[PDB]
Amino acid sequence: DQICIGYHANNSTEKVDTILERNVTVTHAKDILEKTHNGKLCKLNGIPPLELGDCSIAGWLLGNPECDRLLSVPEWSYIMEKENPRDGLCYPGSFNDYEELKHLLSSVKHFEKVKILPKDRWTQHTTTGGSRACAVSGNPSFFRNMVWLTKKGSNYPVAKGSYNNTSGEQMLIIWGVHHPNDETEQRTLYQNVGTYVSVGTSTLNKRSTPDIATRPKVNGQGGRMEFSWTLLDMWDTINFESTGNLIAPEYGFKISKRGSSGIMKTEGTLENCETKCQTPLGAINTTLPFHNVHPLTIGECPKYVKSEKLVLATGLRNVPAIAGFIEGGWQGMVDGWYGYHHSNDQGSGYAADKESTQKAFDGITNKVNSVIEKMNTQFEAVGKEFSNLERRLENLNKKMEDGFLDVWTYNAELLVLMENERTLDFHDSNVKNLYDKVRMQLRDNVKELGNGCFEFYHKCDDECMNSVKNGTYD
Amino acid sequence: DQICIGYHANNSTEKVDTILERNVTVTHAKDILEKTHNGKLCKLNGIPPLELGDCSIAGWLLGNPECDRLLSVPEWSYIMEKENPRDGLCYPGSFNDYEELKHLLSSVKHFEKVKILPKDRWTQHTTTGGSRACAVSGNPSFFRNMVWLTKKGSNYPVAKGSYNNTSGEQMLIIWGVHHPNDETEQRTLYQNVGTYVSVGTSTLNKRSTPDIATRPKVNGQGGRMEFSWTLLDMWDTINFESTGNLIAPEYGFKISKRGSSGIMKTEGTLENCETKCQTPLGAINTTLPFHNVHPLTIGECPKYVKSEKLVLATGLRNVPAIAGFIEGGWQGMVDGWYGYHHSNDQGSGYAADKESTQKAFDGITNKVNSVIEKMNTQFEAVGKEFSNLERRLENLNKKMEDGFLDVWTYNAELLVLMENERTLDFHDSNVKNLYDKVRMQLRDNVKELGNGCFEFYHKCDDECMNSVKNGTYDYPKYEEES
Amino acid sequence: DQICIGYHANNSTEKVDTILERNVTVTHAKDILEKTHNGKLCKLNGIPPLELGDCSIAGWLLGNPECDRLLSVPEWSYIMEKENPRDGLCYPGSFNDYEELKHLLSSVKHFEKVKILPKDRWTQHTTTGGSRACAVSGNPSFFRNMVWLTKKGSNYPVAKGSYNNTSGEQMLIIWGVHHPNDETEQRTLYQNVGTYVSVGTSTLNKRSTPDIATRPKVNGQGGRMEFSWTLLDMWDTINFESTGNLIAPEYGFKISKRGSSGIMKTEGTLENCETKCQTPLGAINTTLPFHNVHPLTIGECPKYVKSEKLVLATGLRNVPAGFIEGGWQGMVDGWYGYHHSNDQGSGYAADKESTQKAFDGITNKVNSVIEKMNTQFEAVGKEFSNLERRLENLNKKMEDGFLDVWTYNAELLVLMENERTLDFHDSNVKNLYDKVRMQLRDNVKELGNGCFEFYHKCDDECMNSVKNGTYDYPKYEEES
Amino acid sequence: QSVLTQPPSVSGAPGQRVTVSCTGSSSNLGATYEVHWYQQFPGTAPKLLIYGSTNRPSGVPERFSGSKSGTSASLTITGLQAEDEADYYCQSYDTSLRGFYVFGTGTKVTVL
Amino acid sequence: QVQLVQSGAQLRKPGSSVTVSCKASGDTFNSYSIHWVRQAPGQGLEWMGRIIPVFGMTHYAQRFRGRITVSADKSTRTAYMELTSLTSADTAMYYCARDGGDKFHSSGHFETNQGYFDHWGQGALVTVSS
Ligand SMILES: *[C@@H]1O[C@H](CO)[C@@H](O[C@@H]2O[C@H](CO)[C@@H](O)[C@H](O)[C@H]2NC(C)=O)[C@H](O)[C@H]1NC(C)=O
Ligand SMILES: *[C@@H]1O[C@H](CO)[C@@H](O[C@@H]2O[C@H](CO)[C@@H](O)[C@H](O)[C@H]2NC(C)=O)[C@H](O)[C@H]1NC(C)=O
Ligand SMILES: *[C@@H]1O[C@H](CO)[C@@H](O[C@@H]2O[C@H](CO)[C@@H](O)[C@H](O)[C@H]2NC(C)=O)[C@H](O)[C@H]1NC(C)=O
Ligand SMILES: *[C@@H]1O[C@H](CO)[C@@H](O)[C@H](O)[C@H]1NC(C)=O
Ligand SMILES: *[C@@H]1O[C@H](CO)[C@@H](O)[C@H](O)[C@H]1NC(C)=O
Ligand SMILES: *[C@@H]1O[C@H](CO)[C@@H](O)[C@H](O)[C@H]1NC(C)=O
Ligand SMILES: *[C@@H]1O[C@H](CO)[C@@H](O)[C@H](O)[C@H]1NC(C)=O
Ligand SMILES: *[C@@H]1O[C@H](CO)[C@@H](O)[C@H](O)[C@H]1NC(C)=O
Ligand SMILES: *[C@@H]1O[C@H](CO)[C@@H](O)[C@H](O)[C@H]1NC(C)=O
Ligand SMILES: *[C@@H]1O[C@H](CO)[C@@H](O)[C@H](O)[C@H]1NC(C)=O
Ligand SMILES: *[C@@H]1O[C@H](CO)[C@@H](O)[C@H](O)[C@H]1NC(C)=O
Ligand SMILES: *[C@@H]1O[C@H](CO)[C@@H](O)[C@H](O)[C@H]1NC(C)=O
Ligand SMILES: *[C@@H]1O[C@H](CO)[C@@H](O)[C@H](O)[C@H]1NC(C)=O
Ligand SMILES: *[C@@H]1O[C@H](CO)[C@@H](O)[C@H](O)[C@H]1NC(C)=O
Ligand SMILES: *[C@@H]1O[C@H](CO)[C@@H](O)[C@H](O)[C@H]1NC(C)=O
Asked: Where does it reside (chain A) (predicted)?
C-alpha cells in the first residue's frame, strides 16, 4: 500500500552548538576536548623524574649540604622542582647565567659526575674550610662538590690546575669567586689582597677580582659567592689560576644522554603510575586532539585550548506508519540513519536504507578524522625562565604563547561550529535525496501525501516494496 | 484564485563580497570593522595620563631642572611621551638598563617620592656642586633628585650611607658614576684618583671605577655620567660607599599602585575627553570586534587588522503580487523576509510568513554573535623598547607581532567571505523550502504556474488563503481540473 | 522525442581530497603548492651575492690574509656564506657582538672601505708586526685592515688617533685588544705592563685592559685577540687611546646602500641565473601562493608550508538517460548542457548561461584563496651565540608556531573549499533540471533518469526555445 | 644682600682672646656653604685670613682660627697683638636673588 | 703670590660711566675666575659680579643687573668692568679678585660656589661728582 521515508530518532539528550542555533539535541556526538587528568605525577615514558623537592638546581649541582641525596641521580624523564625552593645557595651569593643553565638541563636526562680536580691536589693550600651558613648539624661546612681554597700557614701560592676533557662527552664545569665583606676578612682568608681568579678554555677567557664591600647579612653572612659555569668541549682543556678567592670545582658533570626533557614546577611528589603526557596537575591519559587541563605540559600532548566544550555532532538532529521525514524521525528504526516503512497487507515495519546510511556514515567518519588528524603534535618542554632584568623578554615569551593559544582556541571553536552546521545540513539533505530517488522511480503509480509517504495505485507485494528499496522498481 | 511565495526586496545599495561573487547588493548588512577615532588624546578610564612633554623618563626621574613641573605628578592612566624628547640627561651620559626601566613603568600608575638620603647628611663633602649644562636661567645647577659629592676643602673621606626600605612598598633607587675627561679634573673634584663606587642590597652587588679618558663634548662637557637603578625590596637595605665619583640619590620612588598601564609615543597633548581604548591617533568609542586605526593601542581594544572592510551580509540578495520568488523580490512585503502574496474575490493583499522570518532572523543574529563574540579582548600595552645592541630582539618582537597580525587579518577576511556566502544561500534555501512546504500541503488542488505561484482549482477566499499561509488546508473536491 | 539535462565528463585522472571523501577524481583541478626549485644559486634581482666561500664575516671585515679576493667589496644582493667556514680569525680570538654584526649586515648591500687611520701615521710605534698564525706563504703576517701597534725601539708612547665621520654616512669601525699569555710577552711587545685601551664616541665609552694568562693553544698561539665594533654616526668623532695592546683599525666601512638583504648558509657557488626568490636549495621561479621547498628563503616568496599537496578542485566530479546516470563525457563546450533529441537529429550543446556563471564562481573562488596571501621581502633567519639558547629556542618556537598555523589553515581551507566546489556543481545541474521542468510543465513527462519526454512533436527550433526558456506549446497539451 | 651680620667692633688687651661673630641665614651660611674671612688695614686691599671656615693661607699666624656651626660662624684671634688692628669681614655664597656672594657688615678690632 | 694689576683711579660725572680693568698673571688662560668687589669709604665689601674667561661666563649681583657689564680678552689677559647710569653714590673703590676656590677645566664646567679670594688687586678709586 505505502512506503514512508524517514530518518532515525533516539533517546539522546546530547546537545551540540552550531553557527545558526545553540543547544541542538543530536542522536550522536563526539567530544574532542580532553578535560580530565589523573591528579598524579607519573613516570613519563616509564622513566621517573628527578625529584629535587626542596633543592634548587644550583643547590643540586653545587652540592648544598642538604641536597646530599642528589649525589647519585639515576636517569630522569623530567626534573621536578618546587617553586621557590629552600635549599639553594647556603652561602649567600648568586649564580651567573642561571636561567640559561636551567635551560641547558631541559636537554639532559643524565649526568656522570667526574672528579676532575681532586681536593687533595692543592697541597699548597688549605682545602678544609667552611662556614656556619652551610653547616651540617651545627658543624661549619661547605658545598660538597667544590673546594674553598684558603691560605696555608702564612702564604697563598698561586693555585693552578687543569683538566683535558677525555671523559668522552661535553662536560659541565662550575667554579666561583668569593667576595669578602671586609679587608680584614680578605687578609685572614687569603693573605694576598690584590687577588684575581682566571679561567680559560679554547673559547672562554675570564678574569675577575673580588669586590670587598659591606652588604646586608644573608644567612648570617655579609659576604657573597658568585658562581659561573661553562661547557668544556670534548678534547678541550680548562685552565684555572688564582691568587686568592677561588672556589674550585672538585667535580664536573659529563652530559651522558642529551635527549629531550624539561623542568616542571610542582609542589607534589612522584606517585607509582606511568604516562605519555604530564602536566603539573597530573598525567593526561587520552587520544583527543585538544585538552584544557593546563597550559604547560611536558611530553607529546593534545593541543591546549581555552575552551570548555568542543563537540562535533556526528548524528542526526534528534527530533523524535503513516508519516516520516517531514513530521519527525522514527524511534522505531534502529538499523541505520535513513530508511523506509514498507506498509502493505502482508506486514509493515522499518528497514534501513543501507546504501544511504553507509555513504553518510563514512562521510562523517572521514570528516571527524580530517578535523582531529590534522593537528600537529610533538614533544615539548614548554617553558623558560627569565631573570628579573629580562622582563622585556619574559613578556615577549608570554605574549607569543598567549598569541598562539588564542589563534588555536579560536580556530578550534570556529571549526567545530562550522562543521556542526554542515553536519546537520548534510544529514537532512540526505533524507530529501532519498525521497527524490524514490519519487523519480515510481513516477506515476504513486500518490505523494505530503508527509513523506508514497501511496501505490499498483498494489505492492513485499517483493515489490523490496524493488523500491533497491533500484529495481517498475 | 492564487497564492505566491516571495522574498522581501528593498532600496538598499549596501554591498557585500563572498567567495564566489563580489558586489552582491543585500537588503541588510553589518560592518564589524571600526574605522573611526576621535583625533584626541583622552583620559583612559577617566584618569589623565602623565604628560611628559619634552621630558624623557630619565629626565623625569633624575630631576632634569627643565622637568620641574613633574616633581609631584599625580596618578596617571598611561604615560604620554614625545619621540626624541629634549629634557633627558642635561649632563651628558647614559642610563643602564633604561629600556628595562621604561618597561617597568608600564606597571606603574603612581610613585611616592621619598627622601631616603637627605643632602645635608653629607657633612664631610661638598653638596653644592653643579654645572652650566643643567643651568636654569643661566644659573649652573644639577639634577634635582641627586647629590653630586665632591671634595670638602682638600679631602674626600669615604662617603657612606644607607637606607632600610620601611616605606611600605618596593622602591626605585637611581644613582650614578661620574667619568671625568682628565686626571686633573679627577683630582680637582675628588682628590683621590684610584676611586670606586660600591653599591649593594641583598640581591645587588656592584662595584665600579670611573674611566678617565678624552671624549667628544656633549652639551659642552667632555665627561659623562652613568646612571644605574635597582629596586629595593621591602625591608631590605641599600648600602652606598664611595671614594669619589659618586652621584648619590637624595630621593627614591615608592611604587604606589602597581596597576596595568603603558607608554605611548605621541606628539600631542591631553584633551578634555574620556575613553576605554586610546590609540596614538586618538581614542576609539566602539562595540565592534575589529578596528583598523593603529597597530599600537593602550586599553581594552578591538583586534587590529590590516583590512579596509569586514562586512557581514545579514539580509537577502537585494533583487528588485503576481510573480513569486523565481522572478525577483517584492518591494511591497515590508513586514518580514519571507512571505505570501495573494489574491481572490475579496482582496489583493501581501503578507509575511512570520514563522519563517523569525527562524531565519534568529539564525542570522546567532551567526553574527558567533563571529563577534569569539574575539578575546584584554588590556594590553602593545609596545616595547629596545637598545641599539638589541636589533636581533627588536626584529624578533616585530616579527611576532606582524605574524599574528597576518594570521588574524587573514582569518577575519576569510571568515567573513565564507559566512557571507552561506548567509545568502541560507536565505535562498529558506524561500525554496517555503515553496515546497506549501506545495505539499496543497497537493493537486492547485496548478503550479512555474513562477513560484499556485493557482487554485476551487474558490479560495481570505479564510481559505489565511489557513494555507498558516499550515492548514484540505479540499478533496471541486475537481474543475477534469 | 526527449530532451536530457546533464554535465560534461572527461578522460582525467586528477584526484582531489575533500572533508567527506578522499581521492575524488575531478575533471579539472589547480595545484597551488610549488614543489620545484632550480637547484641553482642565482642572482637575486640580477645582482650577484657576495661569495665568501671559505671566509667568515669576521675574516672578510678584518682582512684575514686568505680572504684577499674580498678586499674589493663588490655590491651584493645577499651574502653567501658556508657553514663552519675555515678562514675566520687567523690569530685566535673572539669577536664581541658578532651575531649582532651579522644581523646588521642583513640590511647592507655594499660598503665603501675608507682609510680612516693610515698606518704610517703611527710614527712613534712599530706597525710591521705579525705572527706565524696569519702567515702568508711562510711569512708571518697579520690582518690586512688593521695595525698591530708594538713598541718602537724600547718605548711605547701613548698611542692616539681619531676620526671625524665626514665620509657622508654611518660607518662601521672594528678594533681590538691583544691578550698575551705571559708577562714576558707583554713586555717584549709593549714595554708597559699596566696597560689599557680606551675608545669612545658621543655614545661609546669603553675602556679595557688585557688579561694575561695561560690559555690552550689555538693555531699555535696561547694568546688571544678580542675584537669589538661600533657604528660611528655622522659627524661624530671616535677617539682611540692606548698604552699598549691596541690593534688599531686602518680602515672603516661606510654603509653605502642600507637595503634589505640577508645571509644564506650554503656550501654551493653562484650559477649564471636570475631570480625573485632564492632558497638554499636553489631558486623558486613561480606564481603559486605556497611552496614546500625550504623553510629559509631570501626574497619575496610563496608561503612555506609543511604539506605535500594543496589542490583545489575546479571542475566537476568526473563521473564517466543522463545526469542521474552520469554526465556525458562528450560534451566539449561547457560544464552543464542538453541532449536535444528530435526528428532532424540529436546532438549535444552546452548551457552557456549556467556554465559561465559557474565558471566565474570558481575562478573567483580560486582567487579569493590565493590572492589573500600576503608576501613581503624577508630573510627569515638570525644568528645566536651559544649563551643565548633560551632566545634561540624562543625564535625557533615562534617560527614553528606560525608554520603550523599556516600549514593547518592552508590544508583546511583547501579541504573545505573542495567540498563546497563539488556541492556547487551538483546544485547547479539540479537547478538547471528544475528551471527546465517548471517551464515545460505538463507538456512533457519526467522519465526519472534526468530526461523530459515531450507529449507533442518538438523539433530543433522547439528545442532551441526550450533551451532559452521562451516557449508555450498548447497544441495537444493533453497527455491522452 | 648684606645678610652676614657682624658686631660693629670688638676689643681686648694684648694677650687676650678676641672673637668676631658672623651670623647668616638658611640661604647662605646654612645650605652647607662655607665662610671665608678677610683682614683689612686702612688704605689697603683686604687679604684672605681664613678659608673653608677653618684653614689659614700660608703666612697667616696660628693665632687666627675659624669655626662654624649651623648658620652661624666665628673668627678667633688668640694672643691678641698690637698689630692686629684691622677690619675683619666674613664671606659666603647666598643662593637667593639668582645667586650672589655676600660679605658681612664687618667688625673693627681694637687692641687696648 | 699671584700678581693682578689694576688700573688707576678716575673721576666721572653722574649720568656717565666707569671703566676699571685688571691684568691677570695668566688667570684668563688658567682656570681661576675673576671677580669684582666694591668698597665705599668707611664701609664694608660688596660683591658686584664675576667672569670666567675660560667659558665666557658671567654673573652679576642683583643690585647691578642692567648696570654692570663684565668682559675679558684673554689675548691681553685683561678683565674689564663697565658701569653705567652712574650716580653720586658710586664713589667706592673697586677691586679685582682671584677666586682661588673654584678651579675650572676646559671641556667641562663645574662650580660649587664655595670659593674665596686668595689674591686681590690694589683698588681703583672712582670719584663721582659735578
Ligand atoms: C689532551 O688529551 C687529548 C687526548 O689524548 C689530546 O688530543 C689528542 O692528541 C693526540 C696527540 O696529538 C692526537 O693524536 C689526537 O688526534 C688528539 N685528539 C683526539 C681525537 O684524541 C690533547 O692534545 C691533549 N691536550 C693538549 C695539551 O692539547
Ligand atoms: C629595617 O626595618 C625593619 C622594621 O623595623 C626591620 O624589620 C624588623 O626588625 C626586627 C629586628 O629589629 C625583627 O624582629 C622583625 O622581624 C623585622 N620585621 C619585619 C617586618 O621584617 C628590619 O630588620 C630592618 N633592616 C635591617 C636589616 O636592619
Ligand atoms: C666634524 O666635521 C663636521 C663637518 O665639517 C663638523 O660639523 C660642522 O662644524 C662647524 C664648526 O663647528 C659648524 O659650523 C657646522 O655647523 C657643523 N656642520 C655639520 C655638518 O654638522 C663637526 O663639528 C666636526 N667635529 C669635530 C669635533 O671635529
Ligand atoms: C536509551 O536507550 C539506550 C538503548 O536502549 C539505553 O542503553 C539507554 O539507557 C537509554 N537511556 C535513556 C535515558 O532512556
Ligand atoms: C543551553 O542550555 C543551557 C542550560 O539550560 C543554558 O545554560 C545555556 O545558556 C543554553 N545556551 C543557549 C545560548 O541557549
Ligand atoms: C588509559 O586509560 C585506560 C582505561 O582503561 C587504561 O587501560 C590505560 O592503562 C591508560 N593508559 C595509560 C597510558 O595510562
Ligand atoms: C532488491 O535488491 C537487492 C540487492 O540485489 C536484492 O537482494 C533484493 O532481493 C531485491 N529485492 C527485490 C525483490 O527487488
Ligand atoms: C528607502 O526606503 C526607506 C523606507 O521607505 C526610506 O526611509 C529610505 O530613506 C529610503 N532610502 C533610499 C536610499 O531611497
Ligand atoms: C565591483 O566589482 C568590481 C569587480 O568585481 C570590484 O573591483 C569593485 O571593487 C566592486 N565595487 C566596488 C565599488 O568596490
Ligand atoms: C561612547 O559612545 C556612545 C554611543 O555613541 C555615546 O553616547 C557616548 O557619548 C560615547 N562616549 C563615551 C566614552 O561616553
Ligand atoms: C492559523 O492556524 C489555525 C489552525 O491551528 C487556524 O485556526 C487559523 O485560521 C490560522 N490563522 C492564521 C492567523 O493564519
Ligand atoms: C583527453 O582528450 C583530449 C581530447 O582533445 C586530449 O587532448 C587529451 O590528451 C586526452 N587526455 C588523455 C588522458 O588521454
Ligand atoms: C588515496 O590514495 C592513496 C594512494 O593510493 C592511498 O594510499 C590512500 O589510502 C587513499 N585514500 C583513501 C582513504 O582512500
Ligand atoms: C622565471 O619565470 C618567468 C615566468 O615563468 C619566465 O619567463 C622566466 O624565464 C623564468 N626565469 C628563469 C631564469 O627561468
Ligand atoms: C532563443 O531560442 C530561440 C528558439 O526559438 C532562438 O530562435 C533564438 O535565437 C534564441 N535566442 C537567444 C540566443 O537567446
From this structure: Host apical cell membrane; Virion membrane
Residue C478 carries which side chain, given as an amino acid letter?
Answer: E
**H or E segment at E34?**
strand E32-39
Q: C152 touching B, CB under 8 A?
A: no
Instruction: Specify burial of residue B245 (Cβ count, 10 A radius: 0-12, 13-18, 19+).
Output: buried
Q: How was this structure determined?
A: cryo-EM
Phi, psi of D78 (to 5 degrees): -105, 160
Q: How far apart are the C-alpha atoms of B217 and B223, rounded to whole Å?
A: 8
Cα distances from E53 to residues A407, B60, C82, E26, E59, in angstroms, run 69, 33, 62, 11, 12
CB-CB under 8 Å, A450 with B376: no
**Full set of structural domains in chain A with CATH:** 2-36+284-469 (3.90.20.10), 49-267 (3.90.209.20)
Q: What CA–CA distances, in Å, run from B288 to A231, B14, B36, B304, B374?
A: 54, 18, 11, 11, 12
What distances in angstroms separate CA D57 from CA A341, D89, E93, one per listed residue?
Answer: 128, 16, 25
Give the span between the Cα atoms of B242 and B234, in whole angstroms.
Answer: 24
Q: Write out the three cell numbers for B320.
A: 528588485
Q: For chain E, give every domain's residue range.
A: 4-100
- The pairing of strands B159-164 and B146-148 is unpaired
How far apart CA E8 and CA E20 sit, in angstroms, is: 8
D1 within domain boundaries: no
Cα–Cα dist B477/D17, whole Å: 147
Neighbours of A136 (CB within 10 A): 14
In the numeric block, the cell 515545460 is attached to C440
Alpha-carbon distance of E89 to C55, in angstroms, equals 85
Classify residue D2: in a domain, yes or no: no
Is C385 in CB contact (< 8 Å) with chain B?
A: no
| Residue A430 DSSP code | H
Q: Please give the Cα distance from B100 to B71 (Å, whole number).
A: 22
**Are chains B and C touching, using the cut-off of 8 Å on CB pairs and a minimum of 3 such pairs?**
yes
Tally the domains of chain D. Answer: 1
Which domain range does residue D13 map to?
9-111
Contacts of B394 in chain C (CB under 8 A): none
Q: From chain C, pick out residues whose CB is under 8 angstroms from the CB of A205.
A: 94, 179, 211, 213, 215, 224, 226
Q: Report which bound ligand comes closest to the CA of A318.
A: 4
Q: Which helix (H) or strand (E) holds B439?
A: helix B391-442
Ligand nearest to the CA of B334: 8
Residue that has been written with the C-alpha cell 585538552 in this structure: A291
Q: Taking a C-beta distance cutoff of 8 angstroms, is the pair A223, A157 a contact? A: no
In DSSP terms, B329 is beta-bridged to B7
Say how many CB pairs under 8 Å bridge D and E.
62
The CATH number fitting domain E4-100, selected from 3.40.50.1110, 1.20.1250.20, 2.40.30.170, 2.60.40.10:
2.60.40.10
Whether A30 and chain B come into contact, CB under 8 Å, resolves to no
What residues does ligand 5 touch, defined as CB less than 6 Å away?
A 22-23
Amino acid at D12: G
Give me the CATH number covering residue D99. 2.60.40.10
Contact B254, B110 (CB under 8 A): no
Ligand 9 centroid – CA B311 distance (Å): 14
Question: What nine digits make up the cell of A339?
Answer: 530508511
Cα distances from C260 to residues A310, B405, B460, C107, C409, in angstroms, run 45, 21, 79, 5, 29
| Dist. CA C364–CA C463, nearest whole Å | 32
* Helices and strands in chain C: count of H runs, count of E runs: 6, 33
Among residues B343, B354, B358, the alpha carbon closest in space to that of B453 is found at B343
Neighbours of D25 (CB within 10 A): 17
Name every chain A residue with its beta carbon within 8 A of the beta carbon of B374.
410, 413-414
Block residue for cell numbers 484540505: B474
D–C touching, 3+ CB–CB pairs within 8 Å: no
